[PDB]
Enzyme design. Structure first.
Site, PDB file in Angstrom:
ATOM      1  N   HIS A   1      -4.709  -1.333 -13.135  1.00  0.00           N
ATOM      2  CA  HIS A   1      -5.788  -0.405 -13.480  1.00  0.00           C
ATOM      3  C   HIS A   1      -5.168   0.889 -13.990  1.00  0.00           C
ATOM      4  O   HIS A   1      -4.021   1.219 -13.664  1.00  0.00           O
ATOM      5  CB  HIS A   1      -6.744  -0.147 -12.300  1.00  0.00           C
ATOM      6  CG  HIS A   1      -6.170   0.673 -11.177  1.00  0.00           C
ATOM      7  ND1 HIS A   1      -5.515   0.111 -10.101  1.00  0.00           N
ATOM      8  CD2 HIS A   1      -6.204   2.006 -10.936  1.00  0.00           C
ATOM      9  CE1 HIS A   1      -5.146   1.062  -9.260  1.00  0.00           C
ATOM     10  NE2 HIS A   1      -5.552   2.223  -9.742  1.00  0.00           N
TER      11      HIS A   1
ATOM     12  N   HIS B   1      -5.106   4.145 -13.546  1.00  0.00           N
ATOM     13  CA  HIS B   1      -4.949   5.416 -12.848  1.00  0.00           C
ATOM     14  C   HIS B   1      -3.534   5.953 -13.025  1.00  0.00           C
ATOM     15  O   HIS B   1      -2.598   5.210 -13.335  1.00  0.00           O
ATOM     16  CB  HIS B   1      -5.281   5.263 -11.361  1.00  0.00           C
ATOM     17  CG  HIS B   1      -6.752   5.341 -11.069  1.00  0.00           C
ATOM     18  ND1 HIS B   1      -7.293   5.006  -9.846  1.00  0.00           N
ATOM     19  CD2 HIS B   1      -7.794   5.723 -11.846  1.00  0.00           C
ATOM     20  CE1 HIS B   1      -8.603   5.178  -9.881  1.00  0.00           C
ATOM     21  NE2 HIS B   1      -8.931   5.625 -11.079  1.00  0.00           N
TER      22      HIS B   1
ATOM     23  N   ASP C   1      -1.184   6.895 -11.087  1.00  0.00           N
ATOM     24  CA  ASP C   1      -0.078   6.397 -10.287  1.00  0.00           C
ATOM     25  C   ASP C   1       0.288   4.945 -10.606  1.00  0.00           C
ATOM     26  O   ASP C   1       1.177   4.391  -9.950  1.00  0.00           O
ATOM     27  CB  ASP C   1      -0.372   6.573  -8.783  1.00  0.00           C
ATOM     28  CG  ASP C   1      -1.643   5.876  -8.336  1.00  0.00           C
ATOM     29  OD1 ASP C   1      -2.516   5.609  -9.171  1.00  0.00           O
ATOM     30  OD2 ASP C   1      -1.776   5.615  -7.122  1.00  0.00           O
ATOM     31  N   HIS C   2      -0.334   4.329 -11.614  1.00  0.00           N
ATOM     32  CA  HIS C   2       0.048   2.970 -12.000  1.00  0.00           C
ATOM     33  C   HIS C   2       0.261   2.828 -13.501  1.00  0.00           C
ATOM     34  O   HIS C   2       1.105   2.034 -13.936  1.00  0.00           O
ATOM     35  CB  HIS C   2      -1.001   1.978 -11.493  1.00  0.00           C
ATOM     36  CG  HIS C   2      -1.239   2.101 -10.021  1.00  0.00           C
ATOM     37  ND1 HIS C   2      -0.300   1.716  -9.089  1.00  0.00           N
ATOM     38  CD2 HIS C   2      -2.279   2.611  -9.318  1.00  0.00           C
ATOM     39  CE1 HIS C   2      -0.751   1.978  -7.875  1.00  0.00           C
ATOM     40  NE2 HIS C   2      -1.956   2.511  -7.987  1.00  0.00           N
TER      41      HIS C   2
ATOM     42  N   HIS D   1     -12.477  -0.825  -7.846  1.00  0.00           N
ATOM     43  CA  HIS D   1     -11.613   0.342  -7.732  1.00  0.00           C
ATOM     44  C   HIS D   1     -11.646   1.145  -9.026  1.00  0.00           C
ATOM     45  O   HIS D   1     -11.809   2.374  -9.011  1.00  0.00           O
ATOM     46  CB  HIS D   1     -10.187  -0.095  -7.384  1.00  0.00           C
ATOM     47  CG  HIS D   1      -9.249   1.048  -7.179  1.00  0.00           C
ATOM     48  ND1 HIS D   1      -9.251   1.808  -6.033  1.00  0.00           N
ATOM     49  CD2 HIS D   1      -8.292   1.573  -7.980  1.00  0.00           C
ATOM     50  CE1 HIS D   1      -8.334   2.755  -6.133  1.00  0.00           C
ATOM     51  NE2 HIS D   1      -7.736   2.633  -7.306  1.00  0.00           N
TER      52      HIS D   1
ATOM     53  N   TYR E   1     -15.242   7.156  -2.436  1.00  0.00           N
ATOM     54  CA  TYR E   1     -16.241   6.904  -3.462  1.00  0.00           C
ATOM     55  C   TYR E   1     -17.634   6.965  -2.859  1.00  0.00           C
ATOM     56  O   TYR E   1     -17.854   6.528  -1.728  1.00  0.00           O
ATOM     57  CB  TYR E   1     -16.067   5.518  -4.087  1.00  0.00           C
ATOM     58  CG  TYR E   1     -14.836   5.280  -4.942  1.00  0.00           C
ATOM     59  CD1 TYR E   1     -13.834   6.239  -5.070  1.00  0.00           C
ATOM     60  CD2 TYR E   1     -14.681   4.074  -5.621  1.00  0.00           C
ATOM     61  CE1 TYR E   1     -12.691   5.992  -5.859  1.00  0.00           C
ATOM     62  CE2 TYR E   1     -13.553   3.823  -6.407  1.00  0.00           C
ATOM     63  CZ  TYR E   1     -12.582   4.783  -6.530  1.00  0.00           C
ATOM     64  OH  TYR E   1     -11.470   4.532  -7.309  1.00  0.00           O
TER      65      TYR E   1
ATOM     66  N   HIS F   1       0.050  -0.929  -4.629  1.00  0.00           N
ATOM     67  CA  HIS F   1       0.650  -0.291  -3.470  1.00  0.00           C
ATOM     68  C   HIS F   1       1.146  -1.390  -2.549  1.00  0.00           C
ATOM     69  O   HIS F   1       0.324  -2.163  -2.036  1.00  0.00           O
ATOM     70  CB  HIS F   1      -0.355   0.604  -2.754  1.00  0.00           C
ATOM     71  CG  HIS F   1      -0.814   1.758  -3.589  1.00  0.00           C
ATOM     72  ND1 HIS F   1      -0.071   2.911  -3.727  1.00  0.00           N
ATOM     73  CD2 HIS F   1      -1.916   1.924  -4.358  1.00  0.00           C
ATOM     74  CE1 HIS F   1      -0.700   3.744  -4.538  1.00  0.00           C
ATOM     75  NE2 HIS F   1      -1.823   3.172  -4.930  1.00  0.00           N
TER      76      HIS F   1
HETATM   77 ZN    ZN Z   1      -6.232   3.936  -8.323  1.00  0.00          ZN
HETATM   78 ZN    ZN Z   2      -3.220   3.833  -6.672  1.00  0.00          ZN
END
Ligand code: ZN
Ligand code: ZN
Ligand code: ZN
Ligand code: ZN
Ligand code: ZN
Ligand code: ZN
Ligand code: ZN
Ligand code: ZN
Lengths: 266, 264, 266, 265
Positions: free
Chosen positions: A83, A85, A87-88, A159, A190, A224
């Site tokens: 996805h 975001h 951090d990825h 997510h 959320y 993660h």
């Molecule tokens: Zn995320």
């Molecule tokens: Zn994440």
């Protein structure tokens, strides 16, 4: 009035930025990210595939680990994402510049990546990163093949609207191992019910719980590692307690229901 | 040893200090902060905004618009000096909240669409939410809103897309030629033999002359201090704001000294 | 050897290009397209919404009809789309340049619109048009509101991955009327089964038939008015025999089933 | 009224769509387009570079000629453009999908390419093609290197705002040859003076004539071979009468001045 607040940096736990040496997952599959962020390198006969890149500042580390695996920058052919975001998908734009790799993603991930994670349905502009474009748009169930290794997309929205699990088959100790790289199933802070930006959020999560349960999987990995009980720091025992797809989804659904209880009851 | 954490683009407090609308001419108002210009021009068919300042300034801009009688949906057009975070920061959010269109040249459009990332000089250090330009404009092109004509003048250097905008307003009915000229600074730039900007020096030198040639009674700049404006007081108290000639002269003197130090 | 073929224009039946004057559908809703292509103008006291625009060469006609309806170009606020094919999204790029509108669409429609319809999953580059960008990405069931009229998106993928129905409530001689603008349910020339570019096509159409049957609807309109048995050419009597959502979906599904059977066994 | 007109395809002189086998220009440089549209392939030990691609329907032909040259689709690393009109950038979107090559272009060419040539300053929507994105934005004078071969960009705006000449040095018979691939200098049907969409058009063309005259050049090529007096149909004699940069700019400027004179009158 008093001065407006300064901009906030996206700071993360130190272990998310802790470099690690390549950890072999299967005969052609390697974790090359950090201790607490997954970035999977799959080395085929006709180039390498990267699944996720971690944080923006991880681009150089990924290229260094690719070098240690025998993969020159121009040998990276394809980037896939769980996805989009920060951090990825953080370092995707810089990776494209320095490797020439293409990005394949579904339409939801493509539009989020192209605005650098800004205007997130839940985070607003709290977590941005350098925007990048998808070179190939993927449909649910579509198969992308590199050098004889077939990667299948399974949409699992929740997510993020574009969240995707990728599956492929490698070998391990003389036998095939079906690898599933499944995105997060969490909804951290959320608004779940009646969210004007995501009206069918609950229905999407519930279907995604079931989609994850059904993935072909002998070995599950997550963006993660802690979410699937991996511990990249312990070397060849890193996967000793890794969850099955059933256990991952069930834990996610139980937390989701209780998060929904904290909300619906008020 | 862990990789370094990301760093936020932090600025002097006065860049973030809100102020009430300051009247520049009959329809032209400074509505940004004490040290960042954001100009609102009110026309018969809606409002134009030139620059927005920092990314966290969107709400402030809309509040000042409301004080001027301009609902969010009355903002029709956003023009930019250059697509750095401290001047184009809130453009994406302003588009979402107003429906305004952005007009900019090709260079500014591509940098805005990158959110300021991969800057020729700053890399990824000064970024902001990306936005799209709805209208690409060419050098000298006229954009008209409510019978007010805004003319673009390209002045590459500070960014390849740096632009000055000119229009005529009135001060108590008497015409006033306003020029909103971009920065002419090269803060920390490698000037000579820059692989990412090989004709930088030639572009700055043409741009000093472009600024001096602008039609202008009142000059404003994205940083008011660069043209000797003091937004803490009324605009008539800023009589001794710099002329176009003096602004470009000061910038060219600094540029020449920086080039000399680099060549030495 | 022989020269390569010349490019071929996307040519359509003359009635798709036959201009008509604005036809009142409800108290604030007007058909302003051509005899055989729908383009709906919804006028509020806070500006107007355009749902679809027809073919690329219809831009000037649409603007002329907006002027007859008293909508200055700057007061067209929003453009919504059924799907991003040339005969429905054709003039969107030009309309955005010439008005104050922004486009709201889902991610699939956004990515196809930005390609100008090129690299279509079924049509390739044969049916293209000037690219445009979506300014607002919307999610399934999301509500967009202009001047007190709320428009709700209902995803109905199949004809395109991004196909969307839009619903809103207007009034018509003193009483509310729930209007549904439902997208095409056709599959013209499509490979339905085992399509590597759209692996879940059959499942998506099947769900979309049910989605259309469930729409809040007192008055159905469609991008091709013939599909819901409207006859715009006769004016006030145009709606006299219009289909219900049920009848529309049943007709499309009967044809879909016969096509799939033909693809299964000839 | 009567019905609105049908859409009209961009049809061209059939010689622009006439396939040819690869024609060697220099030791690493080959014309692989059609008889009347240039598409240059530069082959290096680290992959290949394509300069222009011709019309949209030329993608398969270009790839077939690449295979004849030993260049597999994945071996194409870079696409450069003279300008982003349909008859020169036509197949770029398809080539990117099928090769993984990156596009490098200046900001003006990048924005025109990304809208598929639509909303052209002069042609409106008459010459659209499938849009593509630039993966690298280049500045005037910037050097792009592939396999040790350096390509330098020289902006020459006028025919389009983004019009660019590309230069590189190849070899022929053991000696360097400085190749210049200069863009069109034509203004076909353009309103030159007082054009609201391009107010400084004349100033840009006049500066671009001078830029072309100044290019480092032992061998000039152009997107339309006839413009530099190449004849791709005669193989080894194809360049025997090719124009210099001086002659090419002088002919273009004389035509431009006569066009401006008739417009002013
Ligand atoms: Zn995320
Ligand atoms: Zn994440
Ligand atoms: Zn700046
Ligand atoms: Zn600044
Ligand atoms: Zn269609
Ligand atoms: Zn249709
Ligand atoms: Zn041309
Ligand atoms: Zn041409």
């Amino acid at each position: 009035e008093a001065p407006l607040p300064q901009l906030r940096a996206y700071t993360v736990d130190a272990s998310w930025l802790q470099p690690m040496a390549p950890l072999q997952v299967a005969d052609h599959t390697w974790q090359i990210g950090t201790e607490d962020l997954t970035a999977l390198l799959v080395q085929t006969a006709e180039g390498a595939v990267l699944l996720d890149g971690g944080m923006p500042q991880m681009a150089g580390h990924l290229l260094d680990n690719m070098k240690l695996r025998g993969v020159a920058p121009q040998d990276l052919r394809l980037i896939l994402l769980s996805h989009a975001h920060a951090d990825h998908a953080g370092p995707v734009a810089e990776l494209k510049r320095r490797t020439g790799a293409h990005v394949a993603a579904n339409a939801e991930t493509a539009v989020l990546l192209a605005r650098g994670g800004s205007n997130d349905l839940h985070f607003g502009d709290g977590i941005t990163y350098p925007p990048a474009s998808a070179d190939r748009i993927i449909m649910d169930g579509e198969v992308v093949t590199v050098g004889g290794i077939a990667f299948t997309a399974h949409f699992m929205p929740g997510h993020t609207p574009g969240s995707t699990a990728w599956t492929w088959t490698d070998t391990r100790d003389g036998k095939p191992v079906r690898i599933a790289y499944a995105d997060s199933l969490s909804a951290p802070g959320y608004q779940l019910k009646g969210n004007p930006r995501y009206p069918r959020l609950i229905e999407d999560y519930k279907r995604s719980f079931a989609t994850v349960r059904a993935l072909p999987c002998d070995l599950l990995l997550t963006p993660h590692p802690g979410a699937s009980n991996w511990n990249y720091a312990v070397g060849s025992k890193a996967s000793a307690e890794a969850l099955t797809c059933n256990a991952y989804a069930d834990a996610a659904e139980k937390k989701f229901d209780a998060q929904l209880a904290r909300e619906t009851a008020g």
